[model samples]
Target: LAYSNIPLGATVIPSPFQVHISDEQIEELQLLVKLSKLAPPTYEGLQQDRRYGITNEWLANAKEAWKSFDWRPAESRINSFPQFTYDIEGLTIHFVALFSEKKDAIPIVLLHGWPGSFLEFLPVLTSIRDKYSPETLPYHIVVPSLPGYTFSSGPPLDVNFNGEDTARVINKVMLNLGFEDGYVAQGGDIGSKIGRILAVDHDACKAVHLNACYMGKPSSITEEDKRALARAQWFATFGSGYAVEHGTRPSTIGNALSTSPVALLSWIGEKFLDWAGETIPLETILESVTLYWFTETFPRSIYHYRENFPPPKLRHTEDPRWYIRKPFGFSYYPMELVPTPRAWVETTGNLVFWQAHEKGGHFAALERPQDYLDDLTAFCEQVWAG
Candidate 1:
């Protein structure tokens, strides 16, 4: 049956949506940029080029680009693929899909994280799209704007959304797309968390391959593991500055970022620039920021932050959120925020495939598409065979 042939209220509507921003909103953004103010420069800011924080000079240049940049061309490029939304359990889940006609093609779901949207997974689809005809495509690619991200509906105002809810919704998305038999799950960052939940909690989700994994210290630590832990510690101290505020006070940051386009740029632009082991171009960053600005989903996307740091009384120590028994694979990048050693990751879950690499960082799919695709394909080749 076609994706659109599901029962009423659960039917998948193959709607081709495009990104369109109003002239009035654009004018308001420009005016806000015109009236923006900056803090006086600091000693650390001058010496480290925003190793301290978002640099003032970069903001000035980006502000001008935001004011004058054309978004229509980018929109056209993004809207080139097949996009759709399905009403699942009253919430609309938006996704981009490339259904393969090849007999051996396997279904794979790509999930994005906070400060990221479906845009990060676009190039992977584009690369394959350019190389193969639909009939010959090797994989059925489904990239969802995860719950509370981009154009998708977030949890109700009173409900606290968590990764489990994200996994449940995306799993339904896979089923709705007619992959009910089985499918591989691949992700990075928060996507990793959801992928774990899917493989562990959903029987239809056959296997999971992640670009990032969180591992606690194993009973026996190798020298490499120690180094990785040290790197993780360094990140916790220096690189995790915003996370505390984000986790503890999401609404505060959300309100601030949602209201100001320029603030949203610096808050998110810093991650794309700093987290990627390689340089992401200004245009790509702008594309992501512009989507958040237009959709107003930035505020809703921070629920993971809120969920992680809940009220002290409501938090429980009995929660073991990271145990997975399904077949798993991991791509290790040295520059990632936390390069948990393979030994630690193995202890955390069933390890079927793993590869350590020299390049790429937190945003693996966006920074190194070939590596991301290659590693995932390798893992799927192994797990899907079983």
Candidate 2:
């Protein structure tokens, strides 16, 4: 939105303008120019990422991403769809909202975690649309880029940066778009927490769904919880950590990802490859990494973590308010890193529907799109029905 209606007599001063998202070539350049970023474990990350895993194959893929990764498909993919950005408060938040033919149908808003952009859900857009027909199916779907990440603006000014805060605002965005009373929210990682926000704080959502759930044993952890705690500790040992860096000082980490695309790619790609429990095909990994390069939000995207961490009171304090009791659904992939059991998740959110998946991991949508879509379909149907 542009400024208008300035008085004739005086020069008009403007509000703070948002940072513009760099176009494809420049975004890719940021990734490539920062090539040296990976040479020696980023100097700083070595303390955290012991293995660092700078293999010749990784370099080869970078070379190939530069040479063969097609931007036209992605560019066309983005343009072929309807997209827009709304000026919310001071930040220009970017999002895609697909309205179903049936207005009475339920409205569902989906959120993706860091190391992932909305593109992770691109392949499933069809399923999301089809699940709700013009009449019976229930939902108009909206997927957004998190504040300060990719298309959305963030950080210091974007303080409602935690699960509850982000949810409060996005709930407003959904209301601003039209739905005011209730809608369904689904998220994983940061996404799930934010989903909890909408369910717990925003009041705008009808129910919430999670592809992943809280894995840490609730504060009432016990000796029986040792196994879960041990796995959580092992993540710390892997040195390939996001929480410590993101949880403590995101600004330092954000600087690296924002400055260099390759740095962003390597940092992110390693997680995608390492975290996805099962063997993920190389091409799929490249597809997402390349999308970051194309969008140039890699650095900005990491800021979501850098700028926001779950409220300390969430895990440390004893309170059911932190947990979402809204009608909720969960699909558990055997490989998610969080490590908590469903009973533990109940400590935080109401578990209305659930499925135990035999195969999958952290990146369920990309790793197994069909299973992900099906689980979502079943959940939405059941949640909205009841």
lDDT of 1 by residue, 236-310 (tens): 777776777888888898899876788899899888877778889998988899888877888888777656564
Q: Which stretches of candidate 1 lie over 4 Å from their true place?
A: 1-13, 221-227, 310-321
For 1-386, candidate 2 gives per-residue lDDT tens digits of 11111112212222222223346564556456545433543543443433555454565456555556555555566554445666666666676655555545567888888777677777677555545443444456677777755666663443435545567667766776666656888888778777877877776688988876654555665543455456556665773367668766766876767665566666776777667767776556666666665555554554444333555554521256656767978877766766556676666667888787777777777777778878877887887842
| Deviation of model 2 at 122, angstroms | 0.5
Best by lDDT: 1
Model 2 spans with C-alpha error above 4 angstroms = 1-56, 129-137, 156-160, 219-233, 278-284, 290-296, 303-319
Q: Against the unseen true structure, what C-alpha lDDT does each candidate score?
A: 0.77, 0.63
**Residue 53 of model 2: what lDDT?**
51
Distance from true position, residue 309, model 1, in Å? 2.1
